[PDB]
């Protein structure tokens, strides 16, 4: 579990939102595994702008922060889970590190700000899904 929150935003893995994430919806995305919705309260959490490949993630099933190397934001073929069928994932950006199910929402962060959340995982394999793009999250 886990979301940004910056300004009066809650992003979060469309996968793991609420029912009042969907009764206060701002957008929603199922390609990029992400949903939005408005909050009552301001965040403190910063987007990134720019184009690191090097940041840090937090994997709640480690209680650990880790340095990764990451893939740049790309198409990518997601096998079948509860949540969703077998698919291509808009916007994921891959890296070496540990993950489980639980890790998604997770943030990844580089020098300029919050670059994404834990969205997939594998054997060793941890997915990202970009936020960068998401310009109007700034206003
Ligand atoms: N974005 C999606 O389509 C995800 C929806 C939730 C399911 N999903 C995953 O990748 C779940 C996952 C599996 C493993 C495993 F292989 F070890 F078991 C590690 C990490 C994760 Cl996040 C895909
Ligand atoms: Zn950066």
Same mark, same amino acid.
């Not at 990029?32 to 965040?43: E, I, K, M, N, P």
């Given at each position: 579990? /886990? =979301?940004? $929150?910056?300004?009066? $935003?809650?992003?979060? &893995?469309?996968?793991? =939102?609420?029912?009042?994430?969907? =009764? &206060?919806?701002?957008?929603?995305? %199922? %390609?990029?595994? !992400?949903?939005? %919705?408005?909050?009552? =309260?301001?965040?403190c959490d910063t987007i990134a702008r720019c184009d690191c490949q090097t940041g840090v993630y937090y994997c709640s099933s480690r209680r650990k922060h880790y340095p990764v190397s990451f893939s740049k934001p790309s198409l990518i073929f997601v096998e079948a889970s509860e949540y969703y069928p077998a698919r291509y994932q808009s916007h !994921?950006?891959?890296?070496? /590190?540990? %993950?489980?199910?639980?890790?998604?929402?997770?943030?990844?962060?580089?020098?300029?700000?919050?670059?994404g959340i834990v969205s997939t995982g594998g054997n060793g394999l941890v997915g990202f899904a970009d936020v960068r793009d998401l310009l109007w999250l700034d206003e």
């Open positions: 579990s /886990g =979301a940004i $929150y910056v300004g009066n $935003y809650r992003v979060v &893995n469309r996968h793991l =939102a609420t029912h009042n994430d969907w =009764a &206060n919806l701002v957008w929603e995305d %199922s %390609s990029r595994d !992400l949903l939005v %919705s408005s909050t009552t =309260a301001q965040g !994921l950006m891959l890296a070496v /590190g540990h %993950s489980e199910p639980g890790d998604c929402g997770g943030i990844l962060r580089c020098q300029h700000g919050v670059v």
